[PDB]
Curated annotation (Swiss-Prot):
Record's keyword annotation contains Repeat: yes
Native organism taxonomy: Eukaryota, Metazoa, Chordata, Craniata, Vertebrata
Entry protein name: ATP-binding cassette sub-family C member 9
Keywords attached to this entry: ATP-binding, Glycoprotein, Membrane, Nucleotide-binding, Receptor, Repeat, Transmembrane, Transmembrane helix, Transport
Residue ranges of the TM segments: 79-99, 112-132, 185-205, 217-237, 293-313, 333-353, 626-646, 661-681, 754-774, 868-888
Any one Gene Ontology molecular-function term assigned to this protein's record: sulfonylurea receptor activity
Cytoplasmic membrane side: 1-78, 133-184, 238-292, 354-625, 682-753, 889-1137
Membrane-topology annotation of the record: Multi-pass membrane protein
Organism: Rattus norvegicus
Domain (ABC transmembrane type-1) ranges: 74-358, 629-896
Tagged with keyword Plastid: no
Amino acid sequence: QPFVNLLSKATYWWMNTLIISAHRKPIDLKAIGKLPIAMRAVTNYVCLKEAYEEQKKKAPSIWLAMYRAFGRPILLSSTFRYLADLLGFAGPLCISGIVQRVNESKEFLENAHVLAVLLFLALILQRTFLQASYYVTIETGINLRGALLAMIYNKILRLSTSNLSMGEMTLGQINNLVAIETNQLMWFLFLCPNLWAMPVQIIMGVILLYNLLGSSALVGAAVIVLLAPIQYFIATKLAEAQKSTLDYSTERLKKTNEILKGIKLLKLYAWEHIFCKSVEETRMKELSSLKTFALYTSLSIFMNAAIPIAAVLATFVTHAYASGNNLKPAEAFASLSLFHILVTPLFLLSTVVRFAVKAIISVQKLNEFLLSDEDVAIKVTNGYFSWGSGLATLSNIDIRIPTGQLTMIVGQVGCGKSSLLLAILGEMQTLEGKVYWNSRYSVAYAAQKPWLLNATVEENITFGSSFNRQRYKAVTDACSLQPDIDLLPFGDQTEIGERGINLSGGQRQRICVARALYQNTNIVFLDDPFSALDIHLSDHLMQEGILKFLQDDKRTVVLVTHKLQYLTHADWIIAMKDGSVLREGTLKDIQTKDVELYEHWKTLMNRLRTKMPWKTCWWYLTSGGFFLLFLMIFSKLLKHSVIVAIDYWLATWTSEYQTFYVAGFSILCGAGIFLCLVTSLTVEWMGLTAAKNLHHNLLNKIILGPIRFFDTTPLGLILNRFSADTNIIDQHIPPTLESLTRSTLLCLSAIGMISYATPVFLIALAPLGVAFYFIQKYFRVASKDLQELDDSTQLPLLCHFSETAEGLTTIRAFRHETRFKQRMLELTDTNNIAYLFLSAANRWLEVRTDYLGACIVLTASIASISSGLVGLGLLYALTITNYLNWVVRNLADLEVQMGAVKKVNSFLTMESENYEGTMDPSQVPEHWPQEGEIKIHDLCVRYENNLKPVLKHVKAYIKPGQKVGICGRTGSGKSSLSLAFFRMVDIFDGKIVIDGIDISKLPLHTLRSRLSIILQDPILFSGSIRFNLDPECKCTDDRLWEALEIAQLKNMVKSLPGGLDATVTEGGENFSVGQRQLFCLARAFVRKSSILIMDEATASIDMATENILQKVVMTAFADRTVVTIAHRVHTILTADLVIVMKRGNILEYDTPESLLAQEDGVFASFVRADM
Ligand SMILES: CCOc1cc(CC(=O)N[C@@H](CC(C)C)c2ccccc2N2CCCCC2)ccc1C(=O)O
Ligand SMILES: Nc1ncnc2c1ncn2[C@@H]1O[C@H](COP(=O)(O)OP(=O)(O)OP(=O)(O)O)[C@@H](O)[C@H]1O
Ligand SMILES: Nc1ncnc2c1ncn2[C@@H]1O[C@H](COP(=O)(O)OP(=O)(O)O)[C@@H](O)[C@H]1O
Ligand SMILES: [Mg+2]
Ligand SMILES: [Mg+2]
């Protein structure tokens, strides 16, 4: 009975139920059993950590720990591999025996049928052992992958966060370790038994070949063995080319992500075309590298499929012209079978050695990484904290935060404000002075830089807490997100953060503040919650979010803002400057003790089944051009015909049992070499052409789309169309298609030859055909499904790792390390289950196909028994066993990847906007905004069809060169009205007349080129400062410098390294918010347009900076007309005409003095609120 369990485990019957069935119902993690307690990431991690700790006590090297953790399975797998290899070497011997016995006490052992039965049994045993080895090694490799992921995740949680240690590039290295390093180490562990087996297989094969064919065997073995060093050389060249391609791909991906993450600015500036051209240039560089890589892949395939032919040629010619006897058929076919046996190990030994080198470097990298550095609410005495480099960033720190009372700390930009919080949390290094709390309890913390979980908004706000409707609603209302969440595609469940629907900086800050408030933890550390928020939003938030909501819960609050106007509410105040606290006390106490501090603060105030998708497959094939497809298919057909002809020529030559045969064989070998060369070249060329043709139009169409598409569709899918799908099309498909074609042709040729040799074989072909059809049918669905699960469950794993390495401070301030560890384990287990069952399906198919092939070998042999043709048939029967499962697996992979091609193709057909317009090209003036006049008539605007009109028949006219400022409550249509001039939002009724031309009829690019707009949150694109100032590069440097002076950034630019070409980090992160805003103003200036639209430009600007910016703008653009959306009404007091928007209506339209004249005026009330 237990032998039945052993057979079930050897034949992977334990998964037949989930393969034969579960094609009707898709395979889901519910269907797949949870991982056995033995293989869970927890157990593997504890084992590997125990081994590593034993080593560390002995000291530690990761290799010895890995051995002590996963030796026994690897020894078992190597034993299985050796048994499989030895049994497999019984093929050629059996063929030789059968052939010799045919056509005319150990007598029984010589009987032909006995040899046939022995061959069949040996084949089934070899395949069973080989697949058992594969599965044991795969299982051990996946266990190791789980352990390593858990280990590096624990290290990530225990990181240091100092910029000396972590800096900014370290996150990239951490993501690399989680993604590529661990996978490469896992794959080395997958393939390691090859290092044990392949050299021994080569040795045994060459020994048998010598025993069969004297010195000719030595000659052939030398020629063949020359295939290992050549393969290693070509593999090195391929690795170099693929590293270059990877670098160019990462560059292109960063450029694309920048383009489609700030698409609104590009479209408004009409820069989309320039950035797309730059991305296309990077694509051309990537395609040059990819063409080199494809050329070397073609040469690798050529060598793989040719050097064996040259070796056979040398062996047999040397035997013919050296060996006295002729070529007995048995010897010839045994030699051919041995060469077929040795072709795979030699072509793969170079790959396993390269994998071993990559694993050694990966383990060195991991070893390097693991050593990376690591009434009174709170009391600090003689605090002295350092970031790690030994320099005392904070000195003489002594604070006392009252419990249950609001505390605010104030200082200059860069006065040890944000660092003090991290020091309190322990992230900093405590040189001297202990910190004593009421060991620490969880403390809610909203980092200065907002951090967002990729999960939905509801999850981010809740953040692992007991979802309570009342508290959730109260927080969301206090945070002013109730209408903003409704705006997003899903009211309460839309994706957020990287790889989700992008949000404005204000929205991110609001989400983070909501998360901090929602938690029940008593201590709360808020760091610049108002920086991104508008003035109205901040006022609303503090009026009740801080003063009411928190005080209702009697929670200690530590708010870090430079907005002094709210100091009146502070119960305790701490002044920090130059890393030292000026004083700590109440407002009145501080003022009495420090009159100078009060004066400084006042001055600062200044006041069901899915079939194979043939259609997409055919479209991909024809993408290269019908001629290229015809050349590929015809060349492959001719190549395989010539190879079969070589084998048949050998068969006839043996049956003859000489100079006339030598010449024929040599000529056919030459033809085979040439046709292999041609076939490889053509297939790779078709692959390259298809990749280029798809990607070019893909990117062009995506950029040409409409804004709402980016507004709703998550950025994850859009950027996945370029990151993974294009990678698949460029690299994975062409190889898979080539493998499929070659394997199908070889299988068909073998079937044909076997049938020709023994036409009776066709009788047994039918049951074998049916069995193969059923195996193909069931596997091609089970695989597809399991790969779907693997990818869909591997996305969240890397998302979790990335979002953990990001915002360590939040994780360790909430003290939610354990919960995140548990989630990491629960995700890595799921991913490993999916991958493990994918490999189990592969083993299932391989074993069933190997038994099918063993049946084929048995039937072909039995037919042959009842003179060289028998040997030829047996040889091809043996090769069918090798090639059948590869046909099936390549077909499955081709289907899966053509799915990605289909996705890209569907994205290739998308809506757009009528850039052409209708106005006469000659009609437009040379300088259209010459006068700058603006006139409107009953304008009506709606963001999307069937939605509520944002603007309600607003009618307005601006005289040339006038200056008008617009204000109003949030969601009153200010931003939409500003964007109206650019037709970023559809207009139902009314029109906008500028310079006597209705914009509606103008070409979109022409309209959006001659207008200058400054968004609320400034975004600056990576590249040179010149590039940001004018990508078209059509401005003399003098204009750039004049603009920089106008922006007041001339001094900073001069201080820049290159001055005029200083490097700019992605998104303008290099500079400050004020510097970025000034640079955006300069960007607007260079356009030399007469109309400027400032949509809440100075939201993050300070009072003095805002005033100086406004005055310099007015002086510089005195002639030009400007429309400004006022962040604060006080900024637009000196305006020619004032407009206030309320619920999409311009209630007030008159001069600022006239508007202020009205009693209880809305604007007048706003001014009082600001004051
Ligand atoms: C994730 C599973 O991956 C496997 C992993 C294994 C373990 C293994 O010794 N591979 C040998 C192949 C054998 C036939 C020589 C090998 C060696 C060098 C380079 C690639 C490869 N192989 C890479 C995978 C498939 C192509 C040849 C077996 C089989 C598989 C499999 O696909 O089922
Ligand atoms: N994590 C860090 N890595 C490297 N240098 C740091 C780090 N944190 C602080 N510093 C340096 O130590 C000093 C203290 O920073 P401080 O607390 O003043 O930042 P902050 O000005 O409060 O934050 P922000 O300017 O974003 O409001 C600064 O001069 C800063 O450059
Ligand atoms: N992308 C969008 N899709 C649909 N409606 C939008 C979109 N953006 C804004 N709105 C709607 O337009 C109104 C005004 O928004 P907006 O002009 O952006 O802010 P403001 O009120 O500051 O002008 C809001 O009530 C909002 O619901
Ligand atoms: Mg800060
Ligand atoms: Mg707005």
